[PDB]
Design a protein around this ligand. Sequence first.
Ligand SMILES: CCCCCCCCOCCOCCOCCOCCO
Length: 389
Amino acid sequence: VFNLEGFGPVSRAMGGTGAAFDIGPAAMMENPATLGLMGEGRHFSLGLDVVSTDIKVTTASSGNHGNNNGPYFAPQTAFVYRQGRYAFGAGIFAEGGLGTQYGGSSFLSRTSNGVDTGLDQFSRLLVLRVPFSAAYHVTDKLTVGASVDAVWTSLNLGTLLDVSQIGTLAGQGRVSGTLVPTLLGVPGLSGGYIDFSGVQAWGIGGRLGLTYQVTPDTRIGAAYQAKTHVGDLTGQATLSAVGNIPLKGDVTVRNFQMPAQLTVGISHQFNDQLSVSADYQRVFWSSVMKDMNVGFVQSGSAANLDLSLPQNYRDISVFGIGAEYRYNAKWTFRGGFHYAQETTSLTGGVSYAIGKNDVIDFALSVALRKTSVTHSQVNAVIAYQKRFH
Ligand SMILES: CCCCCCCCOCCOCCOCCOCCO
C-alpha cells in the first residue's frame, strides 16, 4: 500500500497485477487463492528487491547523492507445498523502501528565518512481512486462499519542524507536553530536529481472496487485505531545536496504520503464448481517520512533549495491466503498465528456464516523471525458483 508495484518478478513485470493469475509464491502477499494454480510439488523461492529513488527538490536532492542513501536491497525467500486440493506456504517479503537522504548543506536545512544545519534531512521506512498462507480448491472452479502475516515495521527520519511556533497553529489542542518548557523558552526561534535512531514495532496483518474459473481460458479473482495492525513504534531518539538545542530520550508512535485493500482482476489466455491480466485496486486510506501522536520521554525523568498529527486522506485507486508472452519453452517475456491516482510506471520482465524445475526471473518497474519536487523511481526484482516433485 506504500509503493504499489506488486510482489515478485511476475507481478511486478505485469503491472503489479495478480488477482486472477498465477504469480508464484508472491501470491502470499497478493491473492493467496492464486497458490494452488501452481503445480504440485514443493517450491522454493529466493531473490531480492531493489528500490532506486531519485528526488530533486528546488536546489536540494536526496535521491542518489553519494553513498549512504543508496538503495535498499531487501531479500525474499518463499516456500510453497502443492498437493491435490491443497497449497501451504510461508515467506519473508520486505516491502517498503521509501527512503531519502538529502545533504546538510541545502535548505530544508535553512530554517524559518535563516539559520542552518543539524544532523540533517533523511528518512527511511522498512516493512517486513512474514505471511503463513493456505489455498484450497473448494471446487474444480472455485479456489479460496488466505494468509496471516507477522509484520516488522521500521522507520526513522531526520527533519526540522518549524511551523513557526504555535504548536498546532496556536491553541489548537494537539501539541503540548510536560517538557514543552524548553520549547518557547530556550531562545532560538526555529528548528525542531527529531532523530529517530530507529523505531520498530511488531504487528499482525493478513488477507484472503478467491479465484473462479469462469472458463478454461478466463479466470477472475478478488482479494481483500485486512487493515494491518502494527501496534506502537518505539525507539530511542534525540530531539533538538533551534543557536541550536540538543536533547535525548526514547520516543513512541501510536496509530501508524496501514489501510485495508480491495482488489479484483481478470486474466485470459489468448493461446499457448499470450495471456493478459487486468486488476482494479482500491486502497482505503479513508479509514485511517485517527490521531497519530509522537511521544517523548527522556531518562528516568518524565519530561514530556506530545504532538498529535491529524490524519485525513482519501482512498487511492490503481489500475493495472500486463501481458505474459511465452516466446518459447525457456524464455518468457512480460510487460505491463501501472496507473495510480484519485502514479504511472512502465513495467517489464524476462524469465529464463534453466531447464524445468529451475527458473531465474528478472523484472523492473519504471515510474514516469512527476513534477518544486520531481522524482524518478526504479523497482528491480530478481528471483530464483526451483520446484521438487
Ligand atoms: C497517504 C500516504 C501517507 C504515507 C506516509 C506515511 C508516512 C508518514 O509519516 C510517518 C512519520 O511520522 C511523522 C512525524 O512528525 C514528525 C516528527 O515528530 C515530531 C516530534 O515530536
